[PDB]
C-alpha cells in the first residue's frame, strides 16, 4: 500500500553537475509540482491553473513568485521579525526572469489564472538556484497540463580564460567576464539577460548560441519526465476568428493601407477610425443585420489587421508610423549640471523619452546591506529607477516601485557597472537615481545615457562612457526589418524586443525578449550590427555634453567632509 508514486529523471549529468527532477511525492494537489535538485541546491516549483475563465477577462493572468527561505542556508532572518517578508531585490528579479519567457509560450487566447511558485529549500553555496528555479518552473508547467508550449530550458554562461563555461558556480563567476543568462525552447532562444566586460557582439552572440545548445539536455529531460508523469492536457481550442479576418481584410484592407500613407497626425487617425466604424457597420455588428459576429470583438480583429498592415508597410519601404527609416534614431540632447548643488546631474532626451539622472556620493555608511543565502554582503553601486505615470500623460498610484521598475534599474545597473572605477582608485558609494519624466520607448537606455553623463558630471572616473539603445524586429516569411530606437507602441508590434548597451570597445549589457520562433543567428548578427551603429551614434550625441569625467568632485560634497578645510583639520588633528 504505497503512497506516493514517485517519478524521477535523475540522469542528467548536466555539464558535470547532477540534476534530479522529482515528482509525485510533494505537493500532490498542485497541477504540476517538481522538487528539483542541482548539486545540493534544492527548490520546489509548483504550477496551478484555474479550470475556467473569469468573466470579462481581457488579458492572460499569469503570476510568478520565486522566494528564498533563509533556512535554505542554515540561517534565521536578520529582520526585527525574524521571518521572511516582502520580496527582496534578488527575489523580484528572479520572478521576472521566469515570467518573461513563460508568458509568450502559453497558447494565444488562453486567459485562466495561472500561478507558478518557486521556493528555495536548500542552497549549496555554489550552484545558483535561480537557473534551477527556471528549469524547475518549466518542468512543473509541462507536468501540470496547462496549454503551455514548452518546455523552456535555461542556462548561465560565463567567459573565463577565453572560453564559454556552462553554469558557472559562485566562485567561477568571480573570475568570469560575462554573466549571461539565457532561456529558450528547443526551437528558439526566448530571453537573455546579461552583464558583460566590454566583449564583442560575436562573442556575446556566441554565448547565447552556446546556452541554447547546452540547455537542450534539460528540455529533453523535462520531456522525458513529462512523458512518464504529466497530467491530462487541458483541452482548449482558440477561435477560428481566422475566418472573418479574411473577410474584413479584403474589405477595409486597401482602405487601411492608404490610410497609413496619409501623414498629418490627426487625419491619419481620422482615416483609420472611418475604416473601423465602417467594416464595423456591415460586419460583426450583428443586429440590424445578422450575422454578424459580436461587434467589439470585431474590433480586436481589426487591431490585428492594422497591425499586420503597419507591419507590411514597414517591410515594403522602410517607413514608420512617425516617418523614420528603420535605421533612424530620434533627435537627442543631453545636458549636465542641471542641478548644480547635486553631486552630478543630467538631463537626457531622446525623442519623447527623457530622464533626469542625479548621482550622489557617500561612504561606508551608505552601502546597502544585502543578506543573500549565499552570503551576506555590502553593495556600493545603487541605481534606483522611477517611472511616474505623468511620463506617459497618465495618472496612477505613487510610491513603492514595481517589478518593472526594479527590473529596469537592474538593466541599467548592469549596463553601467562594468565601467565603474575600482574601490582603490575611488572609494565611494554611488547612488544614481533616475526619474523618467517622459516615456516613449526606452526609458531604461535613457537612464544608462543619463547615468554616464551624471557620473562624469560628478567626477566619477568612469573608465569609459556608456550608451544604450532599444531595438525591435518585424519578422515575416519573406523578409525581416530591424527597428532602431523603437517607439513605445511599436513595442507591441514586433516579434522581438532587445536593448543593447556598451562602450566604444564592446558590450556591457544585452537584454532580449523574443516572442516567436525563427530568429536565426544570422538575423541576430544583423540586429546587433544595426544596434552597434545606433549606440555609437547616441554616444556621439552624448559626448557633445561631457565626453570625459570632471577632474574633481562637486563642491558639496564628500571625500571625509565637504570641505578640504575640515579634512585638513581632521588630518592635522
Amino acid at each position: 500500500q504505497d503512497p506516493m508514486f514517485d517519478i524521477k529523471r535523475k540522469t542528467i549529468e548536466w555539464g558535470g553537475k547532477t540534476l534530479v527532477l522529482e515528482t509525485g511525492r510533494i505537493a500532490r494537489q498542485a497541477d504540476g509540482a517538481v522538487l528539483a535538485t542541482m548539486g545540493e541546491t534544492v527548490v520546489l516549483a509548483t504550477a496551478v491553473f484555474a479550470k475556467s475563465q473569469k468573466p470579462g477577462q481581457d488579458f492572460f493572468p499569469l503570476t510568478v513568485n520565486y522566494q528564498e527561505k533563509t533556512f535554505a542556508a542554515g540561517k534565521i532572518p536578520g529582520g526585527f521579525f525574524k521571518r521572511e517578508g516582502r520580496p527582496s531585490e534578488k527575489e523580484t528579479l528572479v520572478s521576472r526572469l521566469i515570467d518573461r519567457p513563460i508568458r509568450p509560450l502559453f497558447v494565444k487566447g488562453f486567459k485562466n489564472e495561472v500561478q507558478v511558485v518557486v521556493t528555495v529549500l536548500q542552497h549549496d553555496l555554489e550552484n545558483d538556484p535561480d537557473i534551477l528555479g527556471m528549469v524547475a518552473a518549466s518542468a512543473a508547467l509541462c507536468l501540470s497540463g496547462a496549454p503551455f508550449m514548452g518546455p523552456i530550458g535555461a542556462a548561465r554562461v560565463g567567459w573565463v580564460d577565453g572560453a564559454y563555461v556552462l553554469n558557472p558556480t559562485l566562485d567561477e563567476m568571480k573570475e568570469s567576464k560575462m554573466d549571461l543568462v539565457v532561456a529558450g525552447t528547443a526551437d528558439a532562444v526566448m530571453m537573455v539577460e546579461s552583464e558583460i566586460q566590454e566583449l564583442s557582439e560575436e562573442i556575446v552572440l556566441g554565448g547565447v548560441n552556446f546556452a541554447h545548445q547546452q540547455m537542450q539536455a534539460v528540455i529533453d529531460a523535462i520531456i522525458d519526465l513529462a512523458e512518464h508523469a504529466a497530467k491530462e492536457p487541458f483541452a482548449f481550442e482558440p477561435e477560428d476568428t481566422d475566418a472573418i479576418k479574411a473577410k474584413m481584410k479584403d474589405l477595409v484592407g486597401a482602405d487601411i493601407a492608404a490610410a497609413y500613407k496619409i501623414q498629418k497626425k490627426q487625419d491619419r487617425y481620422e482615416a483609420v477610425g472611418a475604416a473601423k466604424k465602417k467594416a464595423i457597420a456591415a460586419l460583426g455588428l450583428s443586429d440590424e443585420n445578422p450575422t454578424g459576429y459580436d461587434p467589439l470583438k470585431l474590433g480586436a480583429i481589426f487591431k490585428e489587421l492594422e497591425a499586420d498592415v503597419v507591419r507590411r508597410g514597414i517591410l515594403d519601404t522602410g517607413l514608420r508610423i512617425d516617418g523614420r527609416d528603420v535605421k533612424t534614431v530620434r533627435p537627442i540632447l543631453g545636458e549636465v549640471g542641471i542641478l548644480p548643488r547635486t553631486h552630478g546631474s543630467a538631463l537626457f532626451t531622446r525623442g519623447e523619452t527623457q530622464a533626469i539622472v542625479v548621482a550622489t556620493l557617500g561612504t561606508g555608511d551608505d552601502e546597502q546591506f544585502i543578506d543573500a543565502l549565499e552570503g551576506t554582503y555590502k553593495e556600493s553601486f545603487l541605481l534606483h529607477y522611477n517611472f511616474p505615470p505623468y511620463s506617459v500623460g497618465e495618472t496612477g498610484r505613487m510610491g513603492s516601485p514595481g517589478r518593472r521598475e526594479i527590473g529596469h534599474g537592474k538593466l541599467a545597473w548592469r549596463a553601467l557597472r562594468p565601467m565603474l572605477p575600482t574601490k582603490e582608485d575611488f572609494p565611494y558609494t554611488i547612488r544614481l537615481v533616475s526619474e523618467i519624466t517622459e516615456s516613449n520607448g526606452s526609458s531604461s537606455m535613457a537612464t544608462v545615457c543619463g547615468s554616464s553623463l551624471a557620473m562624469m558630471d560628478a567626477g566619477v572616473p568612469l573608465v569609459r562612457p556608456v550608451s544604450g539603445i532599444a531595438m525591435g524586429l518585424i519578422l515575416e516569411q519573406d523578409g525581416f526589418a530591424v527597428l532602431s530606437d523603437i517607439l513605445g507602441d511599436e513595442d507591441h508590434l514586433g516579434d522581438m524586443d532587445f536593448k543593447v548597451a556598451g562602450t566604444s570597445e564592446g558590450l556591457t549589457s544585452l537584454q532580449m525578449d523574443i516572442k516567436i520562433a525563427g530568429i536565426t543567428p544570422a538575423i541576430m548578427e544583423q540586429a546587433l550590427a544595426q544596434a552597434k551603429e545606433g549606440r555609437a551614434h547616441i554616444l556621439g550625441e552624448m559626448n557633445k555634453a561631457m565626453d570625459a569625467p570632471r577632474a574633481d568632485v562637486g563642491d558639496f560634497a564628500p571625500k571625509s567632509a565637504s570641505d578640504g578645510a575640515k579634512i585638513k583639520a581632521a588630518i592635522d588633528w
Binding site: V107, P151, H228
Partner: peptide, 7 residues
Amino acid sequence: PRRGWWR
C-alpha cells in the same frame, strides 16, 4: 505514451 501540450 503521454499526450499533451509540449507535444
